[PDB]
Amino acid sequence: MYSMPGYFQNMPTIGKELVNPNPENEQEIKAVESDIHESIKKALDAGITSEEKLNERGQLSAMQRINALIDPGTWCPLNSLFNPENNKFGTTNIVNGLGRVDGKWVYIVASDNKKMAGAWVPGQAENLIRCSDAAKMMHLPLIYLLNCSGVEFPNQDKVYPNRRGGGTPFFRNSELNQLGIPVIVGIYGTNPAGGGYHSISPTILIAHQDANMAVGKVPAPGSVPIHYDETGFFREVYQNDLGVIDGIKKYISYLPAYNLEFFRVDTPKAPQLPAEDLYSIIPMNQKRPYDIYEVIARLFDNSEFSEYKKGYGPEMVTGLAKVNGLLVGVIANVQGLLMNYPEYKQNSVGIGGKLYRQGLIKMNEFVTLCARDRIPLIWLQDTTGIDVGDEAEKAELLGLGQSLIYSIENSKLPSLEITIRKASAAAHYVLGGPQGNNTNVFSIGTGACEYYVMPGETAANAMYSRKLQPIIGKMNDMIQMYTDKSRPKYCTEKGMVDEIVDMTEVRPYIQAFTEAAYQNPQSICPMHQMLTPRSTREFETFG
Amino acid sequence: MYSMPGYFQNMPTIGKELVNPNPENEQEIKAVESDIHESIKKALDAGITSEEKLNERGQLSAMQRINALIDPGTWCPLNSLFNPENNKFGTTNIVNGLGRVDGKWVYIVASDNKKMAGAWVPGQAENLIRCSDAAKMMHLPLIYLLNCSGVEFPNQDKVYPNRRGGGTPFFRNSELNQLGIPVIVGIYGTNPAGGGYHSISPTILIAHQDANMAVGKVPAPGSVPIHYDETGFFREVYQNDLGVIDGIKKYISYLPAYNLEFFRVDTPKAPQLPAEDLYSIIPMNQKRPYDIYEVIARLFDNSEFSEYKKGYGPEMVTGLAKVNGLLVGVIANVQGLLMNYPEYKQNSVGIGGKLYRQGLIKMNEFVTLCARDRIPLIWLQDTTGIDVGDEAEKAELLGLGQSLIYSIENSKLPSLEITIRKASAAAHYVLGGPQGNNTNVFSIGTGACEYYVMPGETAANAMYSRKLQPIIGKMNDMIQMYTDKSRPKYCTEKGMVDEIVDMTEVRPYIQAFTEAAYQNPQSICPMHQMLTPRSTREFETFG
Amino acid sequence: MYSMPGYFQNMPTIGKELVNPNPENEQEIKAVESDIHESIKKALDAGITSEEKLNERGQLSAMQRINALIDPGTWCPLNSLFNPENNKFGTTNIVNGLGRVDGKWVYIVASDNKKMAGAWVPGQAENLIRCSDAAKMMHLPLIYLLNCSGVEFPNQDKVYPNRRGGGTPFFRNSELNQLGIPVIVGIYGTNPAGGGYHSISPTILIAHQDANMAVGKVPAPGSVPIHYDETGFFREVYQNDLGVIDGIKKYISYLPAYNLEFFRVDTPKAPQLPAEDLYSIIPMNQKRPYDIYEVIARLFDNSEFSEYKKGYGPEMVTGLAKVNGLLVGVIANVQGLLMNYPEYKQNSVGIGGKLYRQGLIKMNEFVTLCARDRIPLIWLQDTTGIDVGDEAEKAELLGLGQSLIYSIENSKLPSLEITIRKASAAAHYVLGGPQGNNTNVFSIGTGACEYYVMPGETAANAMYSRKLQPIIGKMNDMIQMYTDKSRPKYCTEKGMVDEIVDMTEVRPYIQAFTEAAYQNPQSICPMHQMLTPRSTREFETFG
């Protein structure tokens, strides 16, 4: 009951059973992961009010609202620790991510009512734009669990004005609507001005009986007697938080969505090798290489993988894989030394994690093929950059990196980026990096990830070279600075990567992304009209 | 030789001769203006190298390159003092704005080679995105005068990574290209990594004989012997800065552009009343009202203006005007008390600068009419917000403000916003504010402008009310804070408004915007098929 | 002064000097050509009034208006003999095609005022839609030389009503406008109803002093005293036909257009081998093969050609060429027997003109590559179909033909199709056939062309096989029928091919198409970001 089994089923299998486990490496990754989890716990509990205190007053917390809304085990948080402006509570006062509601993936934004009743705080507008952008790119419904008191008077200058401030999301909600993407808001508590516009901008308004939305024992402006009884802007009103959630569930049940079976090329299948091995496979020792095929084997269905142009551009892996039976294009760095590579140099060894002419061209082609086939791209980054020097320049490397950018921009397909370890240099950008604002929905990273323009020592040796012990002290300060400012938690705090996820969460996020991309795609390529599988086949049989 | 003179020529004239000039007011505005000019002067001269020193080494400064490129008197700088991250030199290391080249308006970005040879600095990516966005919205060619050494090692974390960092503009350049908007780069000096990608991302590459672009007495990687002789990426090479500029001029001469006469409905005509009167008309005393018609009379052709729905929504002026013979829709706040207004209240007086039901609906309609007619919108803001209270709420004010946002988002036309004085509350957003990222090309402000969520005293009285002398001291601190953080220079430094312009520069910026919007529009409504003029007429004759 | 000379200049040259000329073949082609020219002459002179009689009355003919408008030698007529409904005068009462005006290519439609003063006749709406569609696809200005008396009362049922009747072009003109494509009308004589709407629908209205346009010694409704003096719909009025033309020239001079130099990769160069040899090269004996490279050598610049995947899919030629220095992708059938081909059969010989797996995939890829690179496609058809049988079916031939359709539809680029000889079967469709209404601007054919579903004898042998002399008489009748209904003139009369052009006119039409496509393209791929040249190179060097 699937198209072209000859192409899409019984694909080459990859990966080996993990013969030599590494407990110390696993220990190190999990300690990054534990720290992430601990920080999130702390950030979610931070504020001026507790879950307990809110509950007594009649209010669920953001997470209680989310957990009430979603199918169990489907919460994929993003921007959990996003806090670029260093808010004391450690958050942007919203909780956001992907969740599934009776089988339909939705993008969720929940005001954190522990923190000045979900007030605007520095960094929040940016966080919200990342949410609407994800919804836009995926053509995925946006859900607000809204409890927003608007602007705090001390810091209005950082939250009220400007191109990408508190006013942008209301336009972003109109754009979503004009693109045919529904926004659904559950309206809680007092929402004047900023919250009022967050309340009115969505497609569907579900209100709490005690909630209000307004421009700005006299009742709070724009309560239910007004926005239900008079204006009719509140389409439905409910006694309590859970009723509002169930109202939301109801309108979500109304939303268009494919039965994903329509797009499957196979029965969903678990990987053949366990994800827990990733804790041994992906080295915390950034100098150590690993086999990327072992990672791909553990993230994609049945450890199946159909490689595009294997042997050409061996610094990269590009090929098709399946996620819950759905087609994705995977683009992943190869680690390790590459003998007699690259081809434009004599007697040379190539460094895995770097980009050369063939990998760039191979990627350009693959993106373009997947673009045409409407197959979403998942990028697995572990990169140290593009090859440098005049031999690299003559090999067109600069133009090829940019060609890839162009190819990506041309794809107009939702894309996921996963930083396995290193996100560095121009390579981070061109490898479906978060800099492609039209394509990259968001990015995630493992506990083994790190982000920099270039390595600490490279930067230090560069800026201080012209010293031809105190200078060596400045150099090592810079190196440690670069280390400090490239740790997973710091990177996600600045939003360089949207979420640091556990090794056992990577596939789930891939599953969430892929199923959300196929939920209601805006463009289709029938399987029998797909070019990637054919060109892939032809390369294997013709040379 | 123009369509429908009966509609578009001999429009009602507006404005009176300035009978009572105000030298003190003029003195106050010009002192803001002088401070702006002084700061710009200082910021342009700041850095590690002088114009003199660069010239000797063979390099023109950003401004010398710009002035060499553009028709005299056509430079309309934007973001001159944009510096949200507080860079010590006071700039984002680029100089940007609109310029005209042999009659064709272009968007210009010039690396400031006085400042670490045009290195990436905090705030620069954002500044650059404002440039590409303007080019996108207007379908206007983007010109780089590029001299970019890439990343400074101390601050890479603030400039290299993230969704809207140093990598975004390369995607933004690809998008421009895919939208059919050409990017032209004059490549100066050393451009590794970041500069390399700034060099390769454009459509046309004009290089200086000593310039280089690269991924990253051995020659600097990717010099002319490489990118001219080998790769051919440098399409043209020139001996000197001026040759590069002339190369750029040549490719600009190749670009498509209407003779604006095609779109004119009239001979360009100067306003009938002089702009210097604006210095008396627009009060620096923010409590004093003024006649907006006196402003509109001095900014638009022949002081002509064709008002839409005069008498309905008297808190707003909406109507058609001409800019160098071209049709624009003007939306401007009315100042002064409005007797027996608004209509949903009894025995009431309306405050000019505020938005009520009729003005919102009138604006919704006018935007929508202009959208259909492909007439670009110029918004003149002097606003204190939307009417508040449950009578305002029953009058649908929240929904109408949002309707306006939707209408704006629906217009998909380039729009200019000019803050005459007050940019405050939700009103700033909905009045074609910079929060509409798809529509507002940029925004400008006069020396009389000020930006806040709400007035200082309102915020102070709000946050401290529940004190039922030291508290009054905290309140007055906040008030002074709000004043500090709402001055024209501060607002433009944070990019709340892109440029503070002289009263005598407002029309020129309007002329630059309008002519740039009509230079190569992506959509046309023939004049005889326009609805705005007809509906306007019908309202005047039918009631 | 061009990008990447290493890729785009000094391309492999092709073709040989014509050693053995064939006067009889040349005689046969030219007799088809002479017949075409004679028929056009006759059709242009047919009607109720002569050029002489019109001139005396103050009216130029369609062709005099066209010749007055265009640069000499640039007229590329289309649909000259289009007459599907068998109008007695042999035309659709309009004259249409491509013309150049002071260097700007435009699409021209001229009412034939010899024939019931340019009245609506059967087939005319369809002819007009082919004109607006071409203008749309190429983003090329549409010019009406209008002299249209509207509907003839005897045949209103065939011209007035329905989805694609006399009313469609007015919507088509609005769409052009909304797409930013200007329509310019010179209005001559009496234009009531149908002509009135043809007059009002354009962007720019230039009227003759005695002309009128209207909904429907009392003056004809909507004369100059009305539509100039009152309504202002006539933007300009002129004394005479030539003044109107010069008015039109003026507004055309106002239109945006690239200097084509912007897009050139080389100096325009004539082919190295003369086109007159095509008269010997292309065999009128449909059983005889020829070398397609000899044709490509004579149509494209400097007989240069950069082949994509030479040796793979040898039934097709796909590669880049230059037309007046501009990049085009060429897709052409290979003639002759192909030893040991195709690959999915054993001990087989392939027939040139047929499509097999590799050529289909190669074409899919090339279209997709050119799509990404924004390189317009020129298809040279000489085809007898796609390989048949279950070996062809297992080789996915049906799915690959459809994949190609999908690829073409995905390209969203203007495309030209030239039927060198045979346009038959599904192959005609998939080879950038006129059935791709979003992509194929129009199609042209040589005097050696012929169009059928399948050959006469194939159809005869198919329908009568089950006769297991009078039946052989029915079969030969059908064969002769198929011959009758597949001749160049008949095919163009039915609009199967838009124009039959002389062998020496093919390149000129290619030059007209290509320059028109690059005049104002809606999307750009910078040369250094193009993938086709790189993938082409990589195939040559890697295997």
Short mmCIF file of C-alpha atoms in Angstrom, two decimals, chain B residues 18 117 150 159 196 258 269:
data_model
loop_
_atom_site.label_atom_id
_atom_site.label_comp_id
_atom_site.label_asym_id
_atom_site.label_seq_id
_atom_site.Cartn_x
_atom_site.Cartn_y
_atom_site.Cartn_z
CA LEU B 18 2.33 81.24 8.11
CA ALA B 117 38.39 48.07 8.02
CA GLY B 150 34.90 40.12 8.83
CA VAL B 159 28.16 38.92 15.47
CA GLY B 196 34.03 37.03 1.41
CA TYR B 258 10.43 53.16 -15.24
CA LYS B 269 5.08 70.63 -8.42
#
